[PDB]
Every structure is written in structure tokens, then in C-alpha cells.
Amino acid sequence: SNISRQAYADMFGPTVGDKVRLADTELWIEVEDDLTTYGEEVKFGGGKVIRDGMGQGQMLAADCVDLVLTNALIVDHWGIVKADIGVKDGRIFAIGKAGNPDIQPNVTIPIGAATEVIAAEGKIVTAGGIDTHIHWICPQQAEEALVSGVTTMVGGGTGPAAGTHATTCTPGPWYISRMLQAADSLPVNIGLLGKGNVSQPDALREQVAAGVIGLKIHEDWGATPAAIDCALTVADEMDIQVALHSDTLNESGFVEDTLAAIGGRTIHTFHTEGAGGGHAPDIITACAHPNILPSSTNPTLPYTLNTIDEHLDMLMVCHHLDPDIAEDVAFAESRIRRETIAAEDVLHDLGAFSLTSSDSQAMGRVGEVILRTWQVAHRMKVQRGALAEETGDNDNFRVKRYIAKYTINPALTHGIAHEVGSIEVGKLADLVVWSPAFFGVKPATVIKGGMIAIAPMGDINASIPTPQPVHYRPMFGALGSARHHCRLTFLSQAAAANGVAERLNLRSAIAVVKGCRTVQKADMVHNSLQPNITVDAQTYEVRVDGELITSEPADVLPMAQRYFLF
């Protein structure tokens, strides 16, 4: 028949042309396309469409999806469209029109007896976040991150030890094997980084052979040109990524010396702004090179009123510095610059910085990677208006540019984009369902490998799952063997060949990293800008093409006091 657009949205979610506000921000998205056939939408419930002989067919399991997310508003680097998502064998099967081919038209995602259903109408579906800057200080970090919407965690550490507090390094074979084993107990995909600070290649190769998918070069372990060059040599020959936290003291040379030692080889620079570490005060200039994949740690995102006051003490504790030792306090202060902190926000908006990470419990907040990326986006719209690439009256391009920062780009940088990072067929089903009012803050459902791992849950004894108190509790996807079957442990090609998974008797699915050496700044989705950026050695001012880059500190932000109890 005919139905008004409003009633339609209330029933099946927004369609082409409708706009939606992301949480309590100023960001608006507009549905670019809708893959449904009007009047043929599948809906589940009493007397609804998905029923035998109607929206559900007679095909066997092999011929129908296992899980269907009906009427989903997909937000991904590739588009903001309305469609049905099909999941088969723990992987993204198709993005199309679900239903029964027997009686419905254009059905690309067949629903059968074997098909479970998740109603996504009026919700936003995104890929699970990927944090490539984890400090394994405590296992409780995984639950915190999973609840925020991050399904993959890469980093290093052995627990609450001095080395791990300061650096993302799982030192050597024994600690690597132990962490690889302990990873099985965690509801997130994991990848370990070893200590790359050594001038003897065999000491690095053993670690890669033991299982790490990358090597962290950290100044606390001595980020000298010899160490850097050494890690990059082994990386080049084993197809693993190198993450760098450069020499803040300028002890072995300045930023240009580090850049020279790197020698145009692929590398991931952590906290490229510098507050989290790096050559004082211009490590930020690294974002200008093609072999550099730059990222920001979250405490400096976005520039706000209390950012500076907060940073000094935070610096001290993480790096085991002494507030009484003059040299220890001067080097901490040379690290915090209002100038570079303000510029970072803008450099993100332009696509000069390509990733966002946490730096969990070592100058970073594990559950605020997504939340802060959107707070930056909001502030940049407010201050700088629409991007040059925007089309139409929405912020669709700014959303694609920012979502890619914690999804696809991190996945490309660490060589796991073939497995995760986006909602594309063939990729593991790591999805997150959000209610528009809580986007980026508190997820409605967090799916892992095709099974819900964590979700808000009310009174276990209630007559429905909605009565208070409602708080995040672990679901079946996080239980014993189901968990193993729904998570990935990323290994290096070498470790895989050596049969490390068999020797350690790892129970989860194994995935291998590849393509870490060939990625470059230009491959970073929507964030490939290489600016002619300069930093004034005295005033610390950041300039791109001579023009001054800067922003103002926010006094109030969205996705903050309106959603949290504390």
C-alpha cells in the first residue's frame, strides 16, 4: 500500500535520505542507500514476516545463513547504508536483502530453519574496534575494551611489572608462550608484540619464531639507531610490524637521525604527537613521511581544559621517573606541549594522523578509544565546519574518515586486515550493534566470531531481560570452548610454520599476519595526507605549509557526563 516516512522509520529504521544524530554530538549521518525492496522487509516477532513458508524458507543449513541482522544501518569506511547482514560459519556472509526466495524478490541472504535472528532495525551496526597499543598489565582490560566495542587487541606485556607498565613488550620465548596460552581465556582477538630493543638479530628472530606479530622499540629499553635498524631488518625478513616510541631525550640524535635510521622502511609510530613519548619537541613531523603509519594515544584526544594539568603526574608514574630528580622532571615537562596537543586534533581531521589507540594504563584509557575519536570529530566539526570532501548536508565523509581510524587502518597497519577490520564478506563476524542515543558510548550488542560475547543484561530472575539493574554481563560467546571457537590468536608466519600452536596446545582459531612491510601512508583509508609540517624548536608551534595549525580546548564534551554514573 503506502506508508508515511515517519511511521516507516519507527517500524523499520531510517531509510534513504533520513538523517540520524550520533549520540549527543553535532555529527549527523544520512542514509546513502537502502538495499531492501519496500514492502518486503523481514521482521521477527509474533505474527511477523520471518515464519515458515513466509520469510523463512525450506533450504538446508548449508544453503542459508546462521545469523541474520535485519534492517541494519551500517556505518563503515565504505558507506552508510541500510541493509540486512548475513553471517555464516562465524564470518560475514553477505550484505543484502534477507528472506525466502520462494515467495520474496531479490533475496540474497536466505533465511531458513537454521537461521537465528537479531533485530537491528533502528540500530547502527559497525565493525569491532581494533586497539594496536595495548599494555597487558591486567587481564581485566579485555572485558573493559570489549564492552566499549573493541574486538581485537594487539600489544605486549606480562602483567603488572615495571617493563609492562612502561612498554608494550612481551620479553622473550617463555613470556611469549605464557601470554599466548593465557590469551585463550580472553574474549578478544589477540596479537603479541615482543621487545625489539636489541642489536643482535637472532635475539629478535627467536621472539618472532616464538609467536609475536610485531616488535616494539621503546626508549626505556634504549631506542638507539642501532636497535631501530636491527628490528627493521628482522621485520623486513619475517613480515611483522614494528611499533616505535622514539628517543625523547635526543640522546642518540634528533628526530631526523631516527628518521634516517628507519631509512624509508615501513613502521608504526605510536603517539606521534609526542606527549606519550618521542623526540622532544618535533616527533610530530614524522606524519609527513610515506613509510610512517602514525597514530595517537587517547588521553590527548581531544584538546580540552584539563588535559595539561592532568598529564605531568601521569607521565611520572608510567615511566618510573622521579619527581625529585631534576632531569626526570625536566624531560617529563619537555614532553607536554599545548602547541602540539592542539595541532593533533586538526591533523586527525585532515587525515595526517591515521590511527587512534589507547596505550592502556600507561598514559591511555582502554575503554575510551572509540569514545574519544568521536569527541575529536565533534569538536572539529564545531571549530572547522565541513571538510572539503563533504557532499550533501551531512557529516558522512567525516564519519567514514574517523571510523576508519579504529577499524580498517589499524588492521592494515598490523597485517590482519584479511581477517578483521571492517564489515566485508569473508571477514570474521566481529560486529557491534548500537542504539543511536548511545553510539560510541555503550553498545546494545557486541558480537564476536558470530556469537554474542557481552551485552547489557537486566535482572537474571526477571520475566524479561529488561528490568533493572542493567549492566554488562558475559554471554555464551565468552564461555570456554565457544570462546575458543569465536576468537583468533594472531601468529607470525614463522611461528605458524614451527607448529607453535600445537606445541603450546593453543585452543583458539589461529590467524597469520601478512603484508606488514608493504603498507604505506597512502594505503590508510581516508587518512593518507602527508603534510609539509614543521615544528618550531623554541615556541613549539606546528605549521603546515607555513600556515599555523591549532585548535581551542573544550570545556564540555558529548558522550561524557550524560552517560556515566561516575
Q: How many CB atoms lie within 10 A of CB 424?
A: 15
Per CB under 5 A, the segment of 40-48, 360-368, 476-484, 507-515 that binds Mn ion is 360-368
> Residues marked as binding for substrate?
218
302 preceded by cis ω (within 30°)? yes
> Mapped to the 3 state alphabet, what secondary structure does 54-73 carry?
CCECCCCHHHCCCEEEEEEE
> Which is closer to Mn ion, CB of 88 or CB of 245?
245
Q: Which of residues 249-268 bind its own copies (CB under 8 A)?
A: 249, 251
475 binds its own copies (CB under 8 A): yes
Question: Of 44 and 270, which CB lies nearer to another protein in the complex structure?
Answer: 44
Which one-letter DSSP state was computed for residue 173?
H
Per CB under 8 A, 561 contacts its own copies: no
Contacts of 398 (CB under 8 A, 6+ apart): 27, 349, 377, 380, 381, 386, 387, 390
Among 123, 216, 319, 378, binds its own copies (CB under 8 A): 319
Q: 23 contacts which partner out of Mn ion, its own copies, another protein, none, CB within 5 to 8 A by kind?
A: another protein
In single-letter form, the type of residue at position 500 comes to V
Reading the block at residue 73, the C-alpha cell is 544501518
Which residues between 455 and 474 bind another protein (CB under 8 A)?
Answer: 456, 458-464, 466-472
Residue 221 binds its own copies, judged by CB under 8 A: yes
Considering only residues 228 to 257 of the shown chain, the ones binding another protein according to CB under 8 A are 229, 249-254, 257
| Contact residue for its own copies among 101, 122, 172, 553 (CB under 8 A) | 172
The DSSP symbol for 36 reads S
Host H or E run for residue 349: helix 338-350
Can you tell me the distance from the alpha carbon of 211 to that of 205, in angstroms, rounded to the nearest whole number? 10
Residues tagged in the binding site annotation: 133, 135, 216, 218, 245, 271, 359
Write each residue from 127 to 166 as x if it is in contact with another protein (CB under 8 A), else as -, in one continuous string.
-------------x--xx--xx------------------
Any contact of residue 6 with its own copies (CB under 8 A)?
Answer: no
Grid coordinates of 443: 553498545
Tell me the C-alpha to C-alpha distance, in Å, between residue 265 and each of 237, 284, 516, 517: 12, 18, 11, 8
**Residues 414, 513: contact at Cβ < 8 Å?**
yes
DSSP letter (8 states) at residue 377:
H
Contact code string over 373-412 relative to its own copies, x by CB under 8 A: ----------------------------------------
Our finding on whether 300 is near another protein (CB under 8 A) is no
437 touches its own copies by CB under 8 A: no
Q: Is 253 or 515 the residue whose CB approaches another protein more closely?
A: 253
The interface with its own copies within residues 30-49 (CB under 8 A) comprises 44-48
Nearer to Mn ion, 76 or 359 (CB): 359
Task: Show binding-site residues for Ni(2+).
Answer: 133, 135, 216, 245, 271, 359
Farthest-apart Cα atoms in the chain, separation: 78
Residue 32 burial (C-beta neighbours within 10 Å; 0-12, 13-18, 19+): middle
* Identified binder of its own copies from the candidate list 321, 329, 510, 560, rule CB under 8 A: 321
Enzyme catalytic residues: 319
Q: For the chain, what is the radius of gyration of the CA atoms?
A: 24
Binding residues for Mn ion restricted to 274-293, rule: CB under 5 A: 277
Matching residue, cell 538446508: 60
Asked if 3 touches another protein (CB under 8 A), the answer is: yes
End-to-end Cα spacing for the chain: 50
Site residues (CB under 5 A) for Mn ion? 245, 277, 359, 362
